[PDB]
């Protein structure tokens, strides 16, 4: 009876309950496009990818102006399956921008991990990170000597979706990255960004905003990007986190990242 019931449950972090309440609202008002937009986004937060894609089609059918969003987010959902294949060591991603050969051992480490060779994988990651070039920069006004993801499977690499294609972007290939705080619920899953490549062009992009294992292995707070937690694997779930020589910065606290020209 309370039109805000699903939102109330959502803000409390009660995802299963929020979904049940929202589904009941949609059943009552099946032509309400606003409810469908909420539902696709909630399903994406919950990692119910096929159902999210079905609801996104309904959004575009009810609200034709939403078709560009439908296309962009449908493909973003497809890319989550590719992320899983990459982190499982079964496929390898496009490298965006100038080649970065040091990423090859970084990817082969994922295959070694999948095969149960954790020691060998760690050795390859050390080789990768040793070969990755040094580029200082700034987060906002604060300088850094180096920057890396807290996820040691990436290190100084940014997962991106550009023009509906997933890629690994070596941070050393960037001039700048600009983001705003998340606004829409879908921003918790894929954060919009403007990327400028060093010696190159600029593009809008989506940044996968949570670690790939979050859907399956995190709790509701992690799925909402409200925390970053380390599992028995020694890897994080939840909101993406960056580390520099000076300290840590959560993705949703980032606004601008600049690298010094080399």
Residue numbers in the entry: 26 to 287
What did the published study say regarding this structure?
Although HsiE1 (also called TagJ) was found to interact with the essential sheath component HsiB1 (TssB/VipA homolog), its exact role in T6SS remains unclear. Here, we solved the HsiE1 structure from crystals diffracting to 1.2 Å. In the E1-B1 complex structures, there is clear electron density for residues 8–20 of the extraneously added B1 peptide and for residues 8–30 of the co-purified B1 fragment, respectively. Both structures are nearly identical to the structure of HsiE1 alone, with an r.m.s. deviation of 0.4 Å in either case, and to each other with an r.m.s. deviation of 0.3 Å. HsiE1 homologs also show conservation of residues that line the hydrophobic pocket with residues 171 and 181 always tryptophan and proline, respectively, and residue 154 always a large hydrophobic residue (e.g. Phe, Leu, or Trp).
